[PDB]
Design a protein around this ligand. Structure first.
Ligand SMILES: OC[C@H]1O[C@@H](O)[C@H](O)[C@@H](O)[C@@H]1O
Ligand SMILES: OC[C@H]1O[C@@H](O)[C@H](O)[C@@H](O)[C@@H]1O
Ligand SMILES: [K+]
Ligand SMILES: [K+]
Ligand SMILES: [K+]
Ligand SMILES: [K+]
Lengths: 899, 899
């Protein structure tokens, strides 16, 4: 006893009080906060690195993969096999490869070539070198990573010191070595820390695991932290495993008050002086040597061995941590001591043995107590995160020291239970611990890799090549011809109807004109004053009127009676009733023009059911209603198509404009054609603006080779199945539906919304052009995109969001391109029509998709350029082709009945 | 009365209850939250746009500028002059330019050319067209801007509808028009909303202003909101004025429950149907017309004028908001009514006049009450932000309606005082209101513009051009020659000392060597085992030892007695005492080599003061101490320079290495020279590694033309004034000091830290290489950089941070370049030395600045490439040139005494 008491005082500084431990527990808690915070992270010693592991094995894990484990006591290679069974275990085998101490102090190159050399042999000796099995990599060192399969070595720790690796990506470095040999082919799908592997390996057997603890050569702990606490990782949903890297605890001076002269000497003779100061007070790679130093000091003071000092006792590394354990055994502790010490050349006395055994006890007890303190900080942290008064969790443990020291386990648990009282912690030990762990993470990594490989293949069908685009342009052009020729027009799908607008405005237009814009329940009347002065100027007014459904489904005699009623109101509203004014009539329903002022209605749409209108000439129905009133008289000069109105509106300013285009809910285009070509209208002189009605392009199957399964579904479920095939791959009314139908598919395959098909996802037209234009916005953050989706009614996650945005993108790009191939055919036909080799033409466009969408117009333009280089086409957003345009068509109209 | 009562019931829906108003107040509060939040902002109708105005006039405002005001009742141009006086007012004049109604409905082009045309005239008529005065621009429309001098028109409101402007930057569009004419030159320094101008114009006279309220043609309110609440603007310090754009309140349906059939008809006949729904219930541009519609409906029902309806009463725009005011005058209200109505063709009865006057009252009272409600929401918001129980603030008001209606002011204040009770609000009216406002913002904008112009000029001196760099390279080369030649060596500043290392390792090296690394209080001894096996392998160990200051300032006999004591310890530590081992001696103090194993100490540094060492040969002092002990014997084979050790260490692996470089606290470089050239050492055969000591380059004034005022200050205040000029523009020991000296300067000029010179800013060496390497980090966010600074002890702001980072950048770039020009001279001399036209050489480098810094090594490399294209130089980070290197020099040493 006297002896033991003499050591206790000598090593008093190595005997920490609970008061002290709690303090240390508190200091670490602060180091944890700083490392997580984005403000102090820059200069924090406890790195708290994100592992990018968001959950423990859910069981659904299955596969066959390899696993490397480098950085611990020994370098082993495992082949883990997690398969499907009826409550039966998982199989796995491992092999340890000797790694020369002069190899971990060499060049990164030699080291990774060694690891590669050992890998190939392992697979070959098992001849599984053919089936490229996924490879997991457990690397126990602080690594920076922004994804599971990347690992930038922050620095080396423990006994490694290979140059040319720090600051580099070990995965690339390994892939580099595996290549150099080319003996085989490896798939490093993931890189994980050993603490992570341990937590995984044990969480598999216990879904309560949230902490991985390593206590061996080195020491470290990882836990499950709230994303909303990990400032340096964008997100807020779920959890992510954090790699504290607590071995560096104190590397900034925080622990100088508890470190002794022996601790500092141990540091001076170390590979990484000044680093991992806490670790050097705890882990097994240092325990043995720490005791030796204490023994040398004592012999030197004649406190032990009667001052006798031998060359062996002074040689670094002669007293291993394994002697510390042998000496602390309950049974043969003191006998082991005598043997060990004796082997050191010393001649120990019974007193010497007891003393040396108490030094061991004091040194290893400190290790235990210190780790209880820091682990307790992680427990309190978990207790706070869950807001629970008492904590219940399972800790995954591993490490040569913890597993082989006879007293560590017990002392560690005892002290821990005394510092962190309101909690019941379960400690699960693991066989390989990080062997099966890297496998579970690899498993998930592979999984997500296939999902992406698949998703990429599905979206590939939407990728049109410049050659396909040329065919599309080729085919559109042929369709155009069939519709112009008189011999095939009746059977053509791209009708190419004549608008009877023989000239674009020339500036000579001057006057006051009325326009009627009818295309729904809310139509409008307008007054447009045009002054052909020195300076072109046009002012206008307009009021909107409603059409009671009762009248929409009225008798056609009431419909036009009501409309003239509204016009009668407007004229008074503008204070201009009296004179016989000219009026342009924009009729946005399926019509067939037989003259500038005549158009037969082929079918009602948008809810109109007025009787005795279909088949009749709308302009006559209007003229008849006007006369029925006898209050005033108008001179209906024309019936107008809004697309044609859009070009006219544009031509008025930009004279090189001879093409109009609409890309909104629907799509159409027009252009000035040569009369000699309009076989449907007598006269080979002059020009004629043609209203293509190009949305029917492909209605005879000519696009059937570029349409996808989702294009077909959208058609199958559309109201006009088999019709408007082209407009269905380009208009804002369907784009969302192609998108929605892809999402449903992916949801079923389980790549989105947890495989759960939402009711909102089942609703058609949920993805309007407005919301389609947002999700793809450059100025939007993924957290906003996610908000938008959730706002629609989709329980999307940051991850879902990334997916939905990609799909949208794929669909809208093809839309713009397919639109470009179309537009590309028109301009070239115009060029060739006039026998030119270079054409400069402007196009007037309108439409909520072209206008609101972030990338449609751009990609569209890029495309027309590639497919039609002999043409220099310019696109100008021209609005109100239905009002201003109809008026301009009217002004040009009256102007021409004079010539 | 009966009449009045008959109207009250007829227009019951226009009479809002306080219950209703408070509800609306609450709805707006929610619209304010959504617009500010990054989650709901995407689809929010109340945009809550950031104005980038962080404070009201602080008085320090002074200058002479112009101001444009477009978008309100009239387009005026002001020339405001805010100067320094003894409590006397500010001067300003304005001029209104007629803007044709057919001009605000035309093209953006014509509109901005009109504004330009009006601008030039204004300045010319005042002939101030010569002095390019700053120009302020008040544009009253929702604009997107990320900086004061940018304004992307979201959309048009009120009566503007010029095409080609929405979605574009009006500033560029204006600058575009001012150019087209080129009559003059304008400086649009800022663009502000009218609400902002009003708040500014009134905050100037009252530092309590936090709200700008407009009630005229249109209606809108801006206030001062907490940056920590403006999710869409990075930051958290101070305040920023938010432009609510509340006219759009309800544009999503939120107010359909309080809008009447008259409100909806007013919308149908509007320019922007469906937009600014709230505004259309309040502002002056609509009040008049809203009453007309109510009157038409009543006549039609024979409720007024005995049902008589006239063409005038039905003409839109015949009843102006100015008639609403005339009619509500206390004195001549009913007489004004009779006159007005009569002018409308109606024949009003006294009863009719009373009724029409009550309609006005009911309509204008609603306007007042509605704006009280929404303003009250902004007050409650301000009360909450300041956490005060009762609110005290000043509101800046303006608007034709508010200023000209006889009853508005009174009704508005009354209702407001009843809804928002715990607060005293001061209402300041402004003359031009936005005239003097745009001027105060312009003032500040100009100010910051000059600071940047200045700062840019100061940092320009640090910009070296490729030609200067070539001169530097030219001069370095000449310096090199003077130092090699025997006739000028004694007077050369770049000493070019011979290291006596005649060969780089060749691989033949094999053995066990000791090294002593002495360069401070903590030196180390090392054992390096080198095996020239089939595979190159080298393992080593080392312990660190301290030198008590008492011994550092000892007698030189004790210093080397102590060192040999440490070596004696180490040999036992490694268990190898006995044999006579070889030892390399790295002596990192000002030494002069006279042989491979001899070096005279020219002067102590780093606190050493040991006596009788200076002038003596350190290797002899060591050999003498060894012999004094008689415990063992060593074979000191060499005295080493760490730079030379760095190259050797590198050559060992990369055989093309013949140049070493150190860039850390200090800087030096070495390279293999041709013996025929080393005039200081006999023998024209073989080579000789030269230790340049290039830090003294420029010590004779040869760099005096590229050194700056701050370079001189750093020298002036350095411990070795006039010496190490080159090393002072490149080493990590001074870079921070050049930086710190610039900051102090800028602080004085008042461009940083509020002109306040911190005590921390006065501390030298505050900017260590570590912190210099961080601030410039690509992976760091400005909020972190700011944290770092504040962590140093600098009360920096996000803005300060942006500045400090730029300075650092300027300084560290020149450092790398100046280093490159130097390195560039060595490689070329080697090339030319061997008469080659292409040279491939590797350079071994080390140093905390080169290693830790984000951009040093890169820019350095880029530079050596440009200046030395006949050379293909490769840079390899080679570490431990002081230990491993000293050993390699020793191994090569013993190996050569055999040849
Ligand atoms: O091996 C246990 C631990 O040792 C520490 O030194 C390393 O930095 C960690 O990566 C590792 O988890
Ligand atoms: O003119 C007053 C207000 O009118 C609103 O319609 C505009 O959108 C605002 O920019 C302006 O502040
Ligand atoms: K986060
Ligand atoms: K024809
Ligand atoms: K903010
Ligand atoms: K010579």
């Amino acid at each position: 006893d006297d002896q033991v008491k003499k050591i206790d005082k000598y090593l008093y500084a190595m005997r920490l009080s609970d008061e002290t431990l709690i303090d240390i527990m508190t200091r670490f808690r602060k180091e944890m906060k700083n490392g997580l915070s984005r403000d102090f992270n820059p200069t924090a010693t406890v790195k708290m690195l994100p592992t990018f592991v968001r959950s423990i094995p859910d069981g659904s894990e299955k596969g066959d993969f390899i696993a490397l484990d480098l950085g611990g006591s020994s370098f082993r290679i495992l082949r883990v096999q997690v398969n499907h069974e009826k409550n039966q275990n998982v199989h796995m085998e491992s092999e340890v490869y000797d790694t020369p101490e002069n190899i971990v102090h060499g060049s990164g190159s030699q080291l990774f070539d060694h690891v590669a050399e050992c890998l190939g042999d392992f697979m070959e000796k098992r001849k599984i070198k053919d089936k490229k099995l996924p490879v997991g990599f457990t690397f126990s060192f602080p690594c920076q990573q922004s994804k599971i399969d990347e690992a930038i070595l922050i620095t080396w720790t423990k006994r490694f010191k290979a140059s040319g690796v720090e600051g580099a990506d070990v995965v690339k470095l390994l892939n580099k070595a595996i290549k150099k040999r080319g003996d085989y082919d490896a798939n490093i799908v993931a890189v994980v820390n050993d603490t992570v592997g341990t937590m995984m390996t044990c969480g598999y057997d216990d879904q309560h695991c949230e902490v991985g603890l390593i206590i061996g050569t080195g020491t470290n702990a990882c836990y499950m932290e709230e994303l909303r606490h990990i400032d340096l990782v964008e997100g807020d949903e779920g959890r992510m495993c954090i790699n504290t890297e607590w071995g560096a605890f104190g590397d900034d001076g925080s622990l100088e008050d508890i470190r002794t002269e022996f601790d500092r000497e141990i540091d001076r003779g170390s590979l990484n002086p000044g680093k991992q100061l806490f670790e050097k007070m705890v882990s097994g790679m240092y325990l043995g040597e720490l005791v030796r130093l204490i023994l040398v000091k004592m012999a030197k003071e004649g406190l032990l061995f009667e001052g006798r000092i031998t060359p062996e006792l002074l040689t670094r590394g002669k007293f291993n941590t394994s002697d510390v354990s042998a000496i602390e055994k309950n049974k043969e502790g003191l006998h082991n001591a005598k043997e060990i010490l004796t082997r050191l050349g010393v001649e120990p006395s019974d007193d010497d043995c007891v003393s040396v055994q108490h030094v061991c006890t004091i040194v290893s007890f400190r290790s235990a107590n210190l780790v209880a303190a820091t682990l307790g900080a992680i427990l309190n942290r978990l207790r706070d995160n869950k807001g629970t008064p008492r904590l219940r969790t399972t800790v995954g443990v591993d490490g040569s020291l913890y597993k082989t020291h006879p007293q560590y386990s017990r002392r560690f648990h005892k002290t821990l239970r005394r510092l962190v009282p309101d909690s019941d912690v379960r400690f699960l030990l693991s066989e390989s611990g990080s062997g099966k762990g890297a496998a579970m993470v690899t498993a998930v990594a592979y999984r997500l890799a296939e999902q992406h490989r698949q998703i990429e293949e599905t979206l590939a069908h939407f990728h049109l090549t410049k050659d396909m685009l040329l065919e599309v342009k080729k085919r559109m052009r042929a369709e155009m011809e069939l519709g112009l020729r008189k011999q095939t027009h009746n059977n053509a799908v791209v009708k190419m109807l004549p608008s009877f607008v023989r000239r674009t405005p020339d500036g000579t237009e001057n006057g006051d004109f009325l326009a009627l814009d009818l295309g729904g329940t809310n139509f409008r009347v307008l007054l447009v004053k045009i002054r052909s002065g020195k300076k072109r100027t046009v002012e206008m007014h307009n009021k909107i009127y409603a059409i009671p459904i009762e009248i929409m489904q009225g008798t056609g005699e009431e419909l036009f009676d009501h409309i003239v009623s509204c016009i009668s109101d407007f004229l008074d509203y503008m204070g201009i009733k009296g004179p016989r004014m000219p009026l342009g009539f924009t009729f946005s329903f399926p019509c067939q023009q037989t003259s500038l002022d005549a158009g037969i209605l082929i079918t009602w749409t948008k809810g109109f059911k007025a009787t005795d209108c279909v088949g009749h000439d709308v302009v006559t129905l209007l003229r008849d209603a006007i006369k029925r009133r006898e209050e005033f008289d108008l001179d209906v000069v024309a019936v107008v198509n809004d697309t044609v109105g859009t070009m006219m509106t544009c031509a008025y300013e930009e004279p090189t404009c001879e093409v109009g285009l609409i890309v909104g809910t629907g799509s159409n285009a027009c252009y000035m054609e040569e009369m000699k070509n309009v076989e449907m209208v007598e006269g080979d002189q002059g020009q004629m603006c043609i209203n293509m009605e190009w949305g029917a392009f492909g209605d005879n199957g000519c696009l059937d080779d570029i349409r996808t399964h989702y294009d077909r579904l959208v058609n199958e479920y559309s109201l006009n199945a088999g019709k408007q095939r082209y407009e269905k791959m380009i208009s804002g009314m369907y784009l969302g539906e192609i998108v929605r139908n892809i999402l449903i598919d992916f949801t079923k395959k389980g790549f989105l919304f947890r495989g759960q098909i939402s009711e909102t996802l089942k609703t058609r037209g949920i993805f309007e052009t407005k919301f389609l234009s947002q999700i793809e916005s450059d100025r939007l953050a993924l957290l906003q995109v996610r908000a938008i989706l959730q706002q629609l009614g989709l329980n999307s996650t940051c991850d879902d969001s990334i997916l939905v945005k990609t799909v949208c993108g794929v669909v809208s790009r093809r839309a713009a391109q397919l639109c470009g191939a179309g537009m590309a055919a028109v301009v070239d036909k115009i060029r060739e029509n006039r026998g030119l080799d270079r054409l400069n033409v402007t196009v007037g466009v309108d439409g909520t998709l072209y206008k609101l969408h972030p990338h449609f117009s751009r990609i569209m333009h890029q495309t027309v350029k590639e497919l039609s280089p002999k043409c220099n086409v310019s696109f100008l957003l021209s609005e109100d082709g239905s009002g201003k345009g109809a008026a301009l068509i009217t002004a040009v109209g009256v102007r021409l009945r004079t010539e």
